[PDB]
Each structure stands twice: as C-alpha cells, then as structure tokens.
Design a protein around this nucleic acid. Structure first.
Length: 48
DNA sequence: CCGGTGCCGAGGCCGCTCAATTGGTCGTAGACAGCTCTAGCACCGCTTAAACGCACGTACGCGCTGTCCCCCGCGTTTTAACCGCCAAGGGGATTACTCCCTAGTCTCCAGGCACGTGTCAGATATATACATCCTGTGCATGTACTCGGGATATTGAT
C-alpha cells in the first residue's frame, strides 16, 4: 500500500501511529533531500 | 433617463518547495603532564660589623588668617551666518568570475657566527691629605613694565 497525504503535520501524526503499531514506516517528503529520495526509491524496488 | 447585476480585475489569505546555515561525530598526531636524575647552585642557617634609619628637641620661615576698591562676570537685547535637513547627478568601490604565480611545504646542504670557557692585566673602587670652586649674602643700577598721546592700519555701510 502507498499512502498519500498533504499536510506535514498530518504526516507526522501518521508517523507517530505507525511507530505505535509495527507496520514499518518509510517516507520521502519534500523536506527530504534529493539523495535520500533517490535512495528510498532505489530501495522500494528490489527491496521488500 | 438611472439602477440592478454579471464579468473581470485585484487584494488578501494560507501553504508548501527549495536553497542556504550551524552543532555533532569521526580520527589521528604532534605537544602538554610528568618522572629522572643531576648539577651545580642559588637558597637557607648561622655568625658578626657597621650605618643608616629613627625619634627628641628646637630654631625659624611660609602658609592661613583679617580689611577697602574697582574690573571682570552676569544678564539683557537684536540679528545673521551657520547648522541641519532634503534631494538629485554620477562616479567608483563592490562583487563575482577566470587565469596566472608565487607563498607554502620539506628536503637537502653547509659554512658563519652565537656561545661558552680559560687566561691575565689594567682600569676602577677606596682611603687620606690638600685646596679652591661654587654658594649664600649683600647691594648698585638699568632693562623693562606702565601711562599717555599721536601715527597707521582695519573694518563696515552707502
């Protein structure tokens, strides 16, 4: 599943919840650097 | 004719999205702690010898203390050149970029002068007798301050 949101505040609350429950949490927002983006995007193919 | 109302244009709100800043971690290497004599050496203990520092009177001037008179300060007035503010033209110091080059590193080399010791001798402290140059005192007089009156500037207003 790919969850899409808009508000960073919302995203943060969602993060808090995804840390409360253990479903893993991988994000790539606009505040993330381009290198971190590229990294996560390489991971999300060829990683499960 | 004027007025309601749609259409368009602008102002206001909110929010990311992205690019620039600054404290935290890794890491390695030359330099602050710290014996180790040593080493000879200043510092301390232990003596006296001489003189300067200190205190007591005591003589003797140089600071505080009281009285008249004008000269400088206080206080007012008007007015004017200057201070302070504002505004516009333009030059030049600023900022950023590429290119050149000599500072910086370190390496190697080596001969000149800092630096210490050893030797010895003459320049300098020191004591005493000699004596004369400088210093306090006293006193004549003249260069210079002061007052008064006539030159030559030296500013301001027509």
């Amino acid at each position: 599943v790919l969850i899409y949101s808009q508000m960073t505040r919302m995203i943060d609350l969602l993060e808090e919840y995804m840390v409360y429950r253990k479903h893993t949490y991988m994000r790539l927002d606009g505040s993330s650097k381009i290198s971190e983006r590229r990294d996560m995007v390489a991971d999300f193919q060829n990683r499960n």
